[PDB]
Amino acid sequence: FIGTASQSRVSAAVTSILTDGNAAATNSFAVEQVLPSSDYVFSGVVAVQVSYATTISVGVGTAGALTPVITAAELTAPVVVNAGTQLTVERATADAISKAATGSRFGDVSGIVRAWSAGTSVLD
Amino acid sequence: FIGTASQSRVSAAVTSILTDGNAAATNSFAVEQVLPSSDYVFSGVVAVQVSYATTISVGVGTAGALTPVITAAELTAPVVVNAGTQLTVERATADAISKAATGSRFGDVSGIVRAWSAGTSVLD
Numbered sequence: 001f002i003g004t005a006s007q008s009r010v011s012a013a014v015t016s017i018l019t020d021g022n023a024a025a026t027n028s029f030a031v032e033q034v035l036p037s038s039d040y041v042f043s044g045v046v047a048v049q050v051s052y053a054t055t056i057s058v059g060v061g062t063a064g065a066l067t068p069v070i071t072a073a074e075l076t077a078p079v080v081v082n083a084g085t086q087l088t089v090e091r092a093t094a095d096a097i098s099k100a101a102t103g104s105r106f107g108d109v110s111g112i113v114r115a116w117s118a119g120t121s122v123l124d
Numbered sequence: 125f126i127g128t129a130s131q132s133r134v135s136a137a138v139t140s141i142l143t144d145g146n147a148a149a150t151n152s153f154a155v156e157q158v159l160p161s162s163d164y165v166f167s168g169v170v171a172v173q174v175s176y177a178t179t180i181s182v183g184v185g186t187a188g189a190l191t192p193v194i195t196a197a198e199l200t201a202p203v204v205v206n207a208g209t210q211l212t213v214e215r216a217t218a219d220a221i222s223k224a225a226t227g228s229r230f231g232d233v234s235g236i237v238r239a240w241s242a243g244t245s246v247l248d
Binding site: 017019021022023024058059060061063064065 | 227228229230231232234235236239245246247
């Protein structure tokens with residue numbers, strides 16, 4: 001759980017404390033997934049499952065107390081292509097470059113790239 | 125005869141007053157036995173015997189009056205191991221501790237001892 005500025009992220013945690021008076025067991029599972037937010041997003045059901053074993057003892061051999069532990073954990077986090085249409089200057093500029101390049105007007109592509117990278121023009 | 129609150133105890137006494145008009149003799153024997161009542165009890169025949177001597181005189185030498193006295197006394201009080209099965213909380217708790225200790229589950233012994241001595245638990 002370190003990414004505070006991340007834009008597309010799932011975080012989950014499962015914790016437990018089980019006791020019968022004589023024995024106790026504390027278990028936790030934490031997980032985190034992060035995506036490049038301009039390309040993919042999380043959309044769907046987020047799901048966690050854990051698996052507790054009853055084959056671990058603390059004490060004297062097979063006569064020890066039974067203390068359940070987590071030995072397997074899993075996560076679902078559905079990943080979907082980003083499809084938002086709110087406009088940024090960069091996205092519109094890239095779209096204009098693509099439109100110029102589809103017509104083989106590479107001089108216009110060069111002009112736009114010149115204006116973007118250094119703010120110049122053809123006669124400058 | 126001082127133990128009023130004792131639970132396993134035998135008390136006995138033999139007294140006599142003998143006279144022929146000119147001489148008299150008073151004799152007594154008192155005895156008491158006390159056991160730890162959780163371990164042993166009295167069960168059987170309680171028996172007392174005393175021994176009177178005819179070799180003691182009061183007066184002028186061998187010409188004195190004959191006054192019998194007690195010079196030996198004895199008691200039987202049969203002692204038997206306590207074998208009652210009425211339940212106390214302490215006896216059942218000790219039995220549970222013994223059962224846990226026979227299986228080398230010393231964590232359970234420790235848990236029961238913790239609950240008995242201070243009323244605590246493992247996570248407290």
